[PDB]
Amino acid sequence: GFLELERSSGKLEWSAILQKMASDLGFSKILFGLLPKDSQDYENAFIVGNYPAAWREHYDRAGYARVDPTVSHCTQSVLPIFWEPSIYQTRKQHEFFEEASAAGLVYGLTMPLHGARGELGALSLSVEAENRAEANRFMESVLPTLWMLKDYALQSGAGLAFE
Amino acid sequence: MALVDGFLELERSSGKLEWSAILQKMASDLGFSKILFGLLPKDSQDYENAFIVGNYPAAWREHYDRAGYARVDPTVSHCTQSVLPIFWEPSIYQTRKQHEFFEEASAAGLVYGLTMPLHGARGELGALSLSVEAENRAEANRFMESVLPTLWMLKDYALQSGAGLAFE
Numbered sequence: 001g002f003l004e005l006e007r008s009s010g011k012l013e014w015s016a017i018l019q020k021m022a023s024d025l026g027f028s029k030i031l032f033g034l035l036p037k038d039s040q041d042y043e044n045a046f047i048v049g050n051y052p053a054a055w056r057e058h059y060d061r062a063g064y065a066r067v068d069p070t071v072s073h074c075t076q077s078v079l080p081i082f083w084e085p086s087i088y089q090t091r092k093q094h095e096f097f098e099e100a101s102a103a104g105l106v107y108g109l110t111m112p113l114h115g116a117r118g119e120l121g122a123l124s125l126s127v128e129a130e131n132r133a134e135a136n137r138f139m140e141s142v143l144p145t146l147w148m149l150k151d152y153a154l155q156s157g158a159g160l161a162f163e
Numbered sequence: 164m165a166l167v168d169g170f171l172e173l174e175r176s177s178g179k180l181e182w183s184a185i186l187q188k189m190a191s192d193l194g195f196s197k198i199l200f201g202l203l204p205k206d207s208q209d210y211e212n213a214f215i216v217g218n219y220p221a222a223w224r225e226h227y228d229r230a231g232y233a234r235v236d237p238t239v240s241h242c243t244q245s246v247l248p249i250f251w252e253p254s255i256y257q258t259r260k261q262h263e264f265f266e267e268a269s270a271a272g273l274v275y276g277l278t279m280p281l282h283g284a285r286g287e288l289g290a291l292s293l294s295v296e297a298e299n300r301a302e303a304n305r306f307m308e309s310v311l312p313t314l315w316m317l318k319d320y321a322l323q324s325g326a327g328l329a330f331e
């Protein structure tokens with residue numbers, strides 16, 4: 001569980017519980033983003049978490065949903081995409097990487113979310129590490145737990161967002 | 164990552180037979196007995212014509228289709244509503260018809276286990292059902308809890324690769 005996320009009422013308590021679950025697991029920053037069936041309106045997604053506010057604003061401002069390589073990945077797969085240097089291919093994606101890094105978001109992964117009612121989302125989690133090798137060792141050590149977490153977060157958060 | 168290397172063979176297969184053999188072995192190696200992987204394309208409710216993989220007794224699968232059990236199987240309705248597992252507990256069989264279903268499934272050797280709902284990136288709807296042989300439900304539940312995180316990863320790997328084989 002999942003216990004607290006269900007007993008919670010309102011976005012504020014739900015966000016605090018999810019953030020703490022991630023933090024306890026070893027991830028300092030998280031974003032839970034969700035769209036309803038047949039929506040591509042990323043700039044109006046249901047968004048939860050503790051990403052820096054200025055970064056979230058810039059992301060929307062710059063239209064980074066069209067650039068961020070994890071977005072297109074999420075439309076095609078249920079498997080995680082790790083924030084590996086190989087995913088940033090274009091010059092725009094290089095800038096995206098640099099800008100996200102400035103915001104403190106360099107190491108992490110994005111778990112695509114695909115709900116029972118056609119919801120489309122992502123749970124992104126970032127880790128503080130001394131290098132990418134350290135980050136990857138940590139992420140591998142907690143991956144099975146994260147994999148369960150993302151589905152619990154999806155089932156709970158879909159109803160909060162749209163119902 | 165070494166953790167997920169096992170799951171990579173699911174994309175390295177050529178054809179439904181090899182894919183089925185790989186999936187069945189991963190499940191068997193993990194400690195489960197019988198499995199059924201079922202998948203439908205976007206918008207489909209045609210359970211009698213799903214893409215199905217596994218080692219459920221053939222006569223049972225034939226019976227399930229014939230008797231229209233998809234209409235009453237509580238794991239089916241659950242999968243339309245949720246991404247979370249549904250464990251095969253007496254409490255999920257509520258209607259008299261679902262009691263019949265449970266009795267018939269038990270005769271086919273399917274009593275303890277769980278169903279992982281599958282929801283694909285392209286609207287695919289499915290289930291990965293796995294049965295457990297045990298002396299009682301408590302032992303069965305103890306085993307299932309011990310392998311659940313591995314199974315949770317497996318079901319998504321199976322879905323991603325399975326969808327390509329079924330529809331792409």
Ligand SMILES: O=C(Oc1c(Br)cc(Br)cc1CNC(=O)c1ccccc1[N+](=O)[O-])c1ccccc1Cl
Nearest residue numbers: 033034045056059070071074100105120121122124
């Ligand atoms: O929430 C979604 O996308 C978003 C939205 Br909107 C806003 C923001 Br800010 C961030 C994301 C997802 N991207 C990341 O978190 C990320 C991934 C790799 C490197 C760096 C970052 N980062 O720092 O942002 C989303 C993605 C796919 C499908 C649906 C949604 Cl709603």
Ligand SMILES: O=C(Oc1c(Br)cc(Br)cc1CNC(=O)c1ccccc1[N+](=O)[O-])c1ccccc1Cl
Nearest residue numbers: 201202210213224227238242268273288289290292
């Ligand atoms: O494959 C799907 O449904 C099916 C289809 Br067809 C055929 C068969 Br035989 C079995 C199922 C799923 N049911 C089970 O495996 C099950 C669950 C609990 C107790 C006993 C059993 N059982 O032994 O049958 C399915 C389910 C949800 C969404 C899509 C699909 Cl294709």
